[PDB]
Amino acid sequence: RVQLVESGGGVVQPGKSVRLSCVVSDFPFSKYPMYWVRQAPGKGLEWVAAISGDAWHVVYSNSVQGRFLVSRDNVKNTLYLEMNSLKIEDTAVYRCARMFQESGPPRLDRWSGRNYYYYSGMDVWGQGTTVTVSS
């Protein structure tokens, strides 16, 4: 079917860098954008970031802004998540996920020129991975 992989978790120190991974079985990736969520151990839940159908739309949150980076190859079916300038309060669980349906090709608005993208929220998760930051 469709089955997720979330690697790269544990405990680190501040002032470091990571690279993460998410390879999910038997799924096209030409038509599907995907997300990141976050599980704090005090049950904190917050949206993180979203990629486009083909890495052309990058939207972050406020606290993560200017610090993180999302990239992806759809040929290798491989997702890259990398984080820099690490805070101690970044201690949480990181989990890979998928979009409900597929969006299509991008839509255009002729009276503007603004090439629109359409999104919709998620459907499924995997197992997640837990990176904690301590001294």
């Binding site: 052309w56 739309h57 939207v59 991008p106 009276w111 503007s112 020129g113 603004r114 090439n115 629109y116 993208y117 359409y118 999104y119 919709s120 929220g121």
Partner: peptide, 14 residues
Amino acid sequence: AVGIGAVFLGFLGA
């Protein structure tokens, strides 16, 4: 959940 993207010339753009 609507995000915008690439651009063109546009109406009255010059």
